[PDB]
Amino acid sequence: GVKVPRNFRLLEELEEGQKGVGDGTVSWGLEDDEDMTLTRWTGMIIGPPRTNYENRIYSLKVECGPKYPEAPPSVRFVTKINMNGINNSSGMVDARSIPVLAKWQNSYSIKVVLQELRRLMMSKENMKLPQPPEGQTYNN
């Protein structure tokens, strides 16, 4: 049961983010390339086809706190989105409402979180929600 410490896990995620995964529909990287603490990340999700999110690039802020990956990261959309589990005024992702966060396991990662959010954009309860105008972002 050898645990990889936070900082070395995040170094692994940095390398994976640079290499990219799958079809490139999610990506992640450090927000500040001088942040030795590896805390603040930028996430990207391409809205999936045949949903009201299609043909939009969503930017997110992902924060990996001191207990990551034992604890989930905090996530917020910067790009405005109407989606169950996302506060529609602030962009904050409610952990209790997104299963990967609510049921977080230490094997998960930033990639997993972003892939889950993209999968949930295809859900019946999200894919037909009418969206805010393209390109708008929340304040803060």
């Binding site: 990889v4 410490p5 170094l11 940095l14 030795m36 590896l38």
Partner: protein, 149 residues
Amino acid sequence: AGLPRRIIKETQRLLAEPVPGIKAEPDESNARYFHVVIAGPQDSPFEGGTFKLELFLPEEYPMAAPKVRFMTKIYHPNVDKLGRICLDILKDKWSPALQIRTVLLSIQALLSAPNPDDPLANDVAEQWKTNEAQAIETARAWTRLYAMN
């Protein structure tokens, strides 16, 4: 149920016989993770500073090399903005005969003798090559700013 003898040994020998200029202490939750402080070596622009380094012994150690990174900002052509280094003996030249100790005093040697000529040197290397006096003064400036507390 526990750690390999080798790791028990290397740890205990570290606390009994530290490398001069290097403090190295295991983490309070993870017996494979160490918090290291390296003193800037004598006669370098890092002298008088103290530099945090973290070290991790992965599952396959010593088959696999230890992982290291600096966690104090440092101006050096072989240590990048995130504290990463490319030390031969941590990759291509790693072998189980080498120990943690070899790695630590080797990192101290790197601080003592920067190598801006390395293929994998970071973007600070050009200044080190072409205006070494200024690069060394900047290394001293960053030691004052980031490595004295």
